[PDB]
Structures are given as C-alpha cells and as structure tokens.
Design a protein around this nucleic acid. Structure first.
Ligand code: K
Ligand code: K
Ligand code: K
Ligand code: K
Ligand code: K
Ligand code: K
Ligand code: K
Ligand code: MG
Ligand code: MG
Ligand code: MG
Ligand code: MG
Ligand code: MG
Ligand code: MG
Ligand code: MG
Ligand code: MG
Ligand code: MG
Ligand code: MG
Ligand code: MG
Ligand code: MG
Ligand code: MG
Ligand code: MG
Ligand code: MG
Ligand code: MG
Ligand code: MG
Ligand code: MG
Ligand code: MG
Ligand code: MG
Ligand code: MG
Ligand code: MG
Ligand code: MG
Ligand code: MG
Ligand code: MG
Ligand code: MG
Ligand code: MG
Ligand code: MG
Ligand code: MG
Ligand code: MG
Ligand code: MG
Ligand code: MG
Ligand code: MG
Ligand code: MG
Ligand code: MG
Ligand code: MG
Lengths: 333, 68, 124
RNA sequence: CAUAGUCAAAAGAAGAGUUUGAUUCUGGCUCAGAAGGAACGCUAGCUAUAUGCUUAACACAUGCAAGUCGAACGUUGUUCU
RNA sequence: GUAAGGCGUGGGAAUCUGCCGAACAGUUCGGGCUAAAUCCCGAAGAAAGCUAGAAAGCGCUGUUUGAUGAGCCUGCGUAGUAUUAGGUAGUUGGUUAGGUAAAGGCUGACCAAGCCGAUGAUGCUUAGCUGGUCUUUUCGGACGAUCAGCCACACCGGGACUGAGACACGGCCCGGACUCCCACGGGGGGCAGCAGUGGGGAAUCUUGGACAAUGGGCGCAAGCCUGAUCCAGCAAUAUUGCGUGAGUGAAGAAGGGCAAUUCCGCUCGUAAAGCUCUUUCGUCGAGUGCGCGAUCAUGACAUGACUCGAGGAAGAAGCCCCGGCUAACUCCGUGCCAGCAGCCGCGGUAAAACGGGGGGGGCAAGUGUUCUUCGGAAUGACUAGGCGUAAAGGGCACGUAGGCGGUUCAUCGGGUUGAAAGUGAAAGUCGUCAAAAAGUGGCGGAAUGCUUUCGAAACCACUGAACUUGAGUGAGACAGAG
C-alpha cells in the first residue's frame, strides 16, 4: 500500500511508524537517492521527465492521493502557483493546516460523515473553498473528543519530535523503552504543566535559540551586524591605537583593549558553521491566514494562503519546475 | 439613475384594505354577481392605470423632443 | 504567391486517400465469411497468418485478420469487423473482433484479454 | 451621505521516432493533447443535470396528440310539483 | 427539396391586419332555411342581436387612431466544378387593357431587339441558412445534432374553397402508387405529433403520470381541452461530483514468486487477519407537513425530500501497459513456429517485444480498441513557406481585363476618421458576484458590422491649374554575323 511508495520516491514519504526492517530498507533507498544525485550530470532525461514526475508524485501524496496532473491539466495554466493556492483554500486541506486532525483522509472522513461545520451550518463537501470571513467549528457532542485528540497530538508531538531528536539522540530500542516513562508523565494535567515549567525544556529552548541564531549567518547576518555598527567598531581600533601610541611613546589597558578588539573581530568575522547534526523539522502554524482558538477548537479565515508557506518537504529547485516562481520577494509570484 | 431620486420620489403605499375584504353572502347567486362586479371594477382600475401611463409617456416624449 | 494571386486563386488542401473506404465512416461493420484461409507475410517476416475473406453488409469484399491463437470460424460465419491494418500482410486492412457474433473469445488468455473477448476468471 | 464610491472583461505559443556507414538539408509517414448524438470489449457503487434512429422523407398494428361556448338559436322528451 | 424567389444584415413603398388598447357615430325595417337565430338574402348608409337571469353590461357595424403580425421590393454578404463557354425567346424593355389588398411580364394584345455571361452566365455535383458546437495563440478547419430565430415540406403529383390569416400535418376536390374492409354495388386510410411495432443498421429509450406550475384555445365566469409542457421510466452516452472507510497491527503468520541461493536471503507486505473509531452513498423502520415549488384556492412529482431512529467495514475496483518513442522487469514455456505490431521493429534454444506466473507503472467507476474532427503540421504558410543543383520560372515576347505605380498648389467630401442616435433577439463564449454542491441567475463586456446626423481634411478616389526626376520624341554623332 503506502510504505512501498518510499521505494518509488527513494525517501520517507510514508508517515507512520517504521519497523527495524523498514529502516534497514530506507538506508539502502537513501543510498540510491545519493548515487542518483551524483549521476545527474550524465542524464538526458533528468529535468523534463524524472524530477517532474517525482515532484508530481510527491505533491499527489502530500494532498491525500489526489490526481494532481489531471486537475492541473483541467486548467490551461502552465505554472502550478494558482492551482496550488486554490488547493490551500480547500476545507480538508485547511482542517489539516489548523492541526485539528492528523491526515487528509481523517479530514475527508470527518467532513463526509457530516461532523464539521462552516459558519455553524453542517457542510459535508470535502472540496469546498473557504474565503476570508469563514468560521470553522465542530459539533457540540463531537468537540470534546477533538479537544482531547488535539492535546494528544500536540503533547505527543513535542515528546515525539522535539524531545527525541533535540539533544536526546538516543538509539531506537532504548528510546522506545524510554518513551513509556515519558508517556506516563503526560497522563495528568499536572504532569503537562510541570513539563512545560521545567529547566529541561528551558535548556532545550535556549539551545534551539542559539542554533537558530547560528543558521542566520548563512545569509551573512553577522556582516549586516558589522555594517550597522561599523563606526563604533572602528572607534574601538582608534582608541586602541591612540592608547598604544600615547601611553607607549614615553599594561592591563593594552590587554583589555586587545581582548575586546579580538572578541569583536572574532564575532564579526567568523564564518557560518554548518554542523553534522541534522536540523529538527518543526511544525508550522498557519497564522498568516488562519486564526485559531484551540480551546473549543474554533477558527476563522481572514486572509489568503502563501505559495512559500505550504509545508511540503520538497526542495525549491525541484518544485520550481512546476511553480516557476521568482522566489525571494515574499509575493505569490 | 441615482439613489436619491428613487429614495425620495417612490410611492411607498399603505396596507391594501381590498385584501381579505370579501364577505360571504347567504346566496350563491348573489356571490356570483358580487364576483362579477369585482371583475368589472378590476377592469375599470386597469383602464385608469393605462390612461395614467399614456400621459406619463407623452410628457416624457415632449420633454425629450424639446431637449433634442 | 502574391496577395493578388491568393485573392484570385486561393490555397487548396493536401490530397490524401482514405484508409478504410469500405467501412463507410462507420466504426464497425457486420460481415459474413466467404473464405477462411492463411497467407504468408511479406519478407523479412515468416509465418502463416490466419485471415478471412469477408463480404460486408454494404456489399463490399474485404480481407480481415483474425487475431489471437486459434479460431472457430468457418464459411458463412458472422463477424464484426473493425479498422486497422496488418503490416505483414498487404491488402489486409481490417480486423475481426473477438467475442462478438460467431468468433469466440479466448479463454485461458489472462493479460490484455479485453482485446480478445476473454472474461475475468472468477476467483474460487 | 451611503441601496454612494471602486472601471474587471480572459486564458490559450512544448516536442519525439523513422531515409544514411555517419552528416546537414528537403520531404512525407507515425506518436504524445483535446473532443463526439458515437460503436464494441472487459469491468461496475451512488446522486443530479444534460443528451439519446446520424442509416430507410422505409412501411406502419393499437391508444392518445383540438376543441369549446346554453350568456347566439330553435327543436323533442324526461323527471317533479 | 432549395446555390438564391432561401438565409444573415441594413433599408424601402405601392399594401393588408382577427383578437388587444383609445376616440367618436349608429345598431332601422321586410323575407328564407319544416323551428328559430348573432345563419342566408333585400332596402336604406353598414349592421345583429342577447340580458331587467349578463339592462347600461356585453356584442356587431362605419370612421379616425396606437399596438402586433403579414404580404411585396431592394443594397450588401453568403458552395465546389472551365476536362461545363455561351445562355435566354415572356426572354429584356416600351405602350395599352386585365388581374391583385398592393409595385411588378403577374399576363393578353401590339411594338422594339434587347437582357445575362471570362468580375464565370448556363450545365453538372453537393447542400436547408443563422445564432452557434468542437478544436486552435489570435487566424483558420470541421460541423449546423440538442436548444432558439428564419425557411421548406407533410404518402407522391395537381388545385382551389372558407377565412383577418392557408393554397392548410391529424380540412376539402382530383389524379397516382400502396394498403384495409366489402353484403362485392362500393367505401376507407396516410406517425417526418407522443408512446409503440416491423425493417435497415455497428447503433439510439416507456404503447408512463398530471394538467399542480408555465404557455395556448374556447367561455362572463364556473370550467373544459392541451403527448405544448411539467414530471417520472430506460441507457456509464456526457459532466472540474461523491463514495468504496479512518486509525492501528509482526505470530514480518500461512500461501505465491525469485534467489552466489547475500542483510527477517529478497519480495508480495502493514499487505491480510485481528483490534479501536465513524457510518457519507446505498439499505431498513418511522414522523410532521400553508418545508418548498402556489397561492384566494388547487401538488403530478411524492413509495421523493427533510427530520429522527436501527445496523455494521459492513453492500461497492477495475482496465490498459512495462524493447525504444513512453512511466514501469524477472521466471517459465515456445523456438522465423505459435504469435505481436501506432511507428521503428520482435520470434531461427538462455525472447525485458510472443503466451502464462510473479512483481511493478498510468489512469480510475472507468479503461482500452475502432470510427470521426481539430492540434502537433510553418504538411496550402493572411498571421507564417517556397521554385540554380531537392517538388516547382511559362521556350520567348506583345498585349485585353485586373493588380500595382512620381512632385506641388487649390477644391471637394465617396472611402478614411471623431462623436451622437438606431440596430446588433434569447441562450452560449469572456468578466464579476451571489446561488448551488456533478444543476442557477443578475449586471456588464463582447457582438470587430450596417443605417442616419454633425464635425476633421493628412492619406486613397474624383476635379482644376502647374512641375520634370520615370516613360516617350527630335537634332547631331556612331557601332553591329539584327
Ligand atoms: K492481436
Ligand atoms: K430571423
Ligand atoms: K410535396
Ligand atoms: K395547465
Ligand atoms: K465503455
Ligand atoms: K467494506
Ligand atoms: K506592356
Ligand atoms: Mg535513403
Ligand atoms: Mg432527430
Ligand atoms: Mg361547434
Ligand atoms: Mg459556374
Ligand atoms: Mg438534402
Ligand atoms: Mg453552412
Ligand atoms: Mg412515410
Ligand atoms: Mg377562423
Ligand atoms: Mg376569401
Ligand atoms: Mg398524422
Ligand atoms: Mg414517433
Ligand atoms: Mg438488424
Ligand atoms: Mg392556463
Ligand atoms: Mg377571455
Ligand atoms: Mg406526455
Ligand atoms: Mg467523475
Ligand atoms: Mg444516508
Ligand atoms: Mg426510507
Ligand atoms: Mg405547499
Ligand atoms: Mg426519483
Ligand atoms: Mg523507461
Ligand atoms: Mg526462453
Ligand atoms: Mg512493449
Ligand atoms: Mg510479454
Ligand atoms: Mg496550419
Ligand atoms: Mg500553429
Ligand atoms: Mg506568405
Ligand atoms: Mg517548404
Ligand atoms: Mg522567385
Ligand atoms: Mg527562361
Ligand atoms: Mg522547365
Ligand atoms: Mg494638398
Ligand atoms: Mg471623405
Ligand atoms: Mg445575446
Ligand atoms: Mg449563465
Ligand atoms: Mg454569469
């Protein structure tokens, strides 16, 4: 059924729990994907047939096994930008984006079975387009199970994403034995409160803050910091040269000024350091166009989606073969 | 052509007392005569409306002629 | 040509002969077999291709190919005829449709079997 | 003031195989797209809206598809008081 | 059937117009149909009366009008074919009579010799036309089926009558073919209305329900008719629709396939089963109905829908393909056989190409095959191609039509151009919103055009006066197997 699609796409496109055997298969599949990417220089069919078919397959998997090629061919447009922006306003897609449910098939089952409301009326149309001003809610007898499942999704999300890979990179079997003790703490509201107010997650937060700060240097952030503060960074060197001229022509001051200037030069001139450890993939929140109150839960659409904020795991260079977007301006172009 | 002309010069009318004004007689023959008289009155009112509309169209035509 | 020449004498179309004139712009035509025989292919191919001489309902005489392995056709058997030539055999421009009228389907065929009139085998 | 004001009327431009020992050109054949009042094979759960003798303007069983007015007019004959 | 007596578009004069709206005047008297009349005839001036049950309400007649239709005419636009070059003889025109509601060779008579045609008449073949449908970077091509507008036809030919209107699908007369009765003398019929049947064909539906809605006829109404319509039935024929579950699950079960027989040996495969959740669609059981279509009232659809309840993943996945073009590979069988094939090509003992197993890819209630159209095809080239050697410069000229072609100044307003008015039906295409959830509508835009009025005056055409650079002459010198 669905794990076999990883063999077709040479990566983890399946989103269920992998066995030991499936991880051993994925190692070989990712080796194949690495050897194919090196081989691209000598492939005549790489751009027009291979990458485009793989991207279309990934997009079809992403939107819950929809016929993406067929529906896009229904329109006469070459680029996928208006087609994908229109797909983001669907009712099942939005119910996935709000994190009220886990997968697109869950959302389709809930909408089809007459259990989600739009503007307090029951709407059972899975492909319905929501424009700005629409209010989304659940049924009164249905909303308590939805609230429980939303809490479970978020707290097992932090425990299963933000705790396994962030500084607790444990082997599989012993982390699986360790997860029972972590699941017992989430059994109570007091345990969730105390996990939230803990120095463990505070250290994890501080390390992730520093890690996000380091990744900004790939854009030359520290050079912009130096360009903002060029005059006073120079004034430090003027002060050092003035002191080392005046108080020397006839030593803690010299050591202090040297330490400060070397610290500043190191902080402003050190290149970006991309470490071996893989970046943790974070859950996105659709706050540019969807306003959510997770207590009931309810939501209101107030804006349109963005072509650069669709949470697909496809690279930009591959997806540009379908979108043809001038990226970098922030617009839906 | 504009909102103000329509909002000021529209005849908004009261409730019509003709609706529900039938009183059931004790003789079906008299009831048939009464319904026949109602039809005749409707014909007279329609003819008066036709005359009013004829005069309105004539005045508009005269104004357009003098403007042209 | 000049524009004046095109005004006087326009542009004609390309002239291409009809491929299946005997079908008379119909998708299929019923026929009756006159002679069932074999024919050898044009070289470099070599076989014994099973054909049938068919008189159509519009009184056209054609040669039609019998596809698949084995058939039950005889003289005076009703066959439904569709277009499509056989490249080995010049003068054979049509096909017999398997599983309709007298030409039976091929049981035991398993792959591509709607082109041979074969039903889906029921699972037991 | 305001049931005002906003100036929209498109989108749509793709190539491949096949003549030669190889090449470029000329030039056809074939293929990938969309579609139909379609037909046939295999296979089929549902709702809705469309469409459904393209051939013989061939021959037609049967029932129905144009009547209404007694407020135009006599006529005869039914009942009952 | 019809190639222009049609159609599209815009105009015109020499006409008529029931019902409908609005004025005015009348509605009198005799006779006839076995009996009468709003039937027929006569007199004036044309007529017609009914109702005190419909008594100042209908109806009729005459005259002026509006409105709607109809007849007639006309400019422009609208197939192929020259291996069809002449066609016409009431033909083309004139005069005078007749006919028509009305112009008119519409036609009798007389007179003239015209009229049409290489800007394609006439002949032959095919064809209803339009709005539009499909396709397409604009253009074009194919089509003209549904629906709407116009026309033509109603078994095949020919006629007229009645009528406001017909030369009349379910009217009449005549002739013909076919057919059904006949008591044998003679009569009757016309589904290309809706259903339906034979037949032909690859192929195309029920001998259904109701006049509830909308439209139409008659009636003062009450109503009555209405196979118009509305609504059900059959058919994957079409449609960017929905569903066939959502999670979890390792004994990685059994079984199937492959394997130096590599890593649970690899794979079918988290796939199944099992376990938990939800029951859309369909199924079953009920309940309200001025929910709604319809209102003063009337509901065929409706055994529907809506609302509630029962139940259990239960009832719902195929078809084509896997040598290249073109996404997807192994085993067995066969051995130039059997077979495959859109093209190139495969098969002669290790076939990824034939046929089966196993696996996989694309689409998906469809998917292939055939037919047909456009595209790719710049492969009839306006957009947008060519002709030395590849298809293609006429052997070479002269000239008809046609096409194309210098300057200035002045005039003009046909083309051109600007604005206004009329028209360009609705539906469809495009924009937008709302509605709806496979369904609808409003407002726009577009409809590139034609007619009228009034501006402009550069260009094209036309008119006038001029110019000399292109063409042609003269005078004087020449050359030449013209
Ligand atoms: K075959
Ligand atoms: K018309
Ligand atoms: K006829
Ligand atoms: K009715
Ligand atoms: K089919
Ligand atoms: K099931
Ligand atoms: K000349
Ligand atoms: Mg050659
Ligand atoms: Mg028809
Ligand atoms: Mg009568
Ligand atoms: Mg001709
Ligand atoms: Mg015809
Ligand atoms: Mg035509
Ligand atoms: Mg007939
Ligand atoms: Mg009449
Ligand atoms: Mg008459
Ligand atoms: Mg009839
Ligand atoms: Mg019929
Ligand atoms: Mg038959
Ligand atoms: Mg009615
Ligand atoms: Mg009436
Ligand atoms: Mg009916
Ligand atoms: Mg569909
Ligand atoms: Mg249900
Ligand atoms: Mg029920
Ligand atoms: Mg009702
Ligand atoms: Mg029904
Ligand atoms: Mg491939
Ligand atoms: Mg072998
Ligand atoms: Mg193949
Ligand atoms: Mg094979
Ligand atoms: Mg072309
Ligand atoms: Mg083109
Ligand atoms: Mg050209
Ligand atoms: Mg060329
Ligand atoms: Mg040339
Ligand atoms: Mg020459
Ligand atoms: Mg030559
Ligand atoms: Mg001038
Ligand atoms: Mg002019
Ligand atoms: Mg229109
Ligand atoms: Mg519409
Ligand atoms: Mg619209």
């Amino acid at each position: 059924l669905r794990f076999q699609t990883c063999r077709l796409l040479l990566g983890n496109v399946w989103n269920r729990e992998l066995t030991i055997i499936q991880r051993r298969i994925l190692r070989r599949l990712r080796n194949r994907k690495r050897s194919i990417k090196k081989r691209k220089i000598y492939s005549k069919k790489y751009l027009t047939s291979y990458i485009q078919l793989q991207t279309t397959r990934k997009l079809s998997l992403f939107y819950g096994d929809l016929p993406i090629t067929e529906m896009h061919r229904g329109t006469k447009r070459t680029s996928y930008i208006p087609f994908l922006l229109n797909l983001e306003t669907r009712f099942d897609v939005i119910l996935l984006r709000l994190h009220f449910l886990e997968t697109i098939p869950q959302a389709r089952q809930l909408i089809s079975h007459r259990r989600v409301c739009v503007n307090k009326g029951m709407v059972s149309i899975t492909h319905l387009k929501l424009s700005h001003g629409d209010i989304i809610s659940f049924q009164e007898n249905n909303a308590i199970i939805r609230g429980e499942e939303i809490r479970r999704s978020f707290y097992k999300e932090i425990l299963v994403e933000k705790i396994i890979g962030k500084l607790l990179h444990q082997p599989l079997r012993m982390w699986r034995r360790s997860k029972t003790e972590w699941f017992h703490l989430l059994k109570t509201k007091r345990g969730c409160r105390l996990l939230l107010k803990s120095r463990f997650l505070q250290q994890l937060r501080s390390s992730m803050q520093e890690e996000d700060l380091e990744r900004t240097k790939k854009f030359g952030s520290e050079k912009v910091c130096l360009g903002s503060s060029f005059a006073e960074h120079k004034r430090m060197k003027r002060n050092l040269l003035k002191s080392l001229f005046l108080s020397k022509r006839r030593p803690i001051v010299y050591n202090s000024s040297l330490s400060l200037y070397s610290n500043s030069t190191y902080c402003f001139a050190s290149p970006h350091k991309l470490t071996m450890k893989r970046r943790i993939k974070r859950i996105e929140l659709p706050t540019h166009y969807l306003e959510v109150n997770y207590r009931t839960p309810k939501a209101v659409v107030f804006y349109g989606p963005n072509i650069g904020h669709i949470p697909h795991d496809i690279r930009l260079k591959d997806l540009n073969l379908l979108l043809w977007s001038r990226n970098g301006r922030g617009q839906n172009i | 052509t504009h909102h103000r002309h329509h909002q000021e010069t529209h005849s908004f009318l009261e409730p019509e007392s003709y609706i529900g004004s039938w009183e059931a007689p004790k003789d079906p023959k008299d009831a048939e005569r009464m319904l026949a008289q109602l039809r005749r009155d409707y014909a007279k009112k329609v003819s008066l409306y036709r005359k009013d509309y004829v005069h309105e169209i004539e005045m508009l035509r005269v104004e357009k002629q003098r403007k042209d | 040509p000049t524009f004046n020449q095109l005004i006087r004498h326009g542009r004609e179309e390309k002239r291409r002969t009809d491929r299946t004139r005997a079908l008379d712009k119909c998708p299929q035509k019923l026929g009756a077999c006159l002679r069932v025989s074999t024919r050898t292919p044009k070289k470099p191919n070599s076989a014994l291709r099973k054909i049938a001489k068919v008189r159509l309902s519009n009184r056209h005489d054609i040669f039609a190919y019998i596809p698949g392995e084995g058939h039950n056709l005889q003289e005076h058997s009703q066959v439904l005829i569709r277009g499509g030539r056989v490249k080995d055999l010049p003068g054979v421009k049509f096909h017999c449709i398997r599983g309709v009228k007298d030409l039976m389907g091929i049981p035991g065929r398993r792959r591509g079997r709607s082109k041979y009139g074969a039903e889906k085998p029921k699972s037991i």
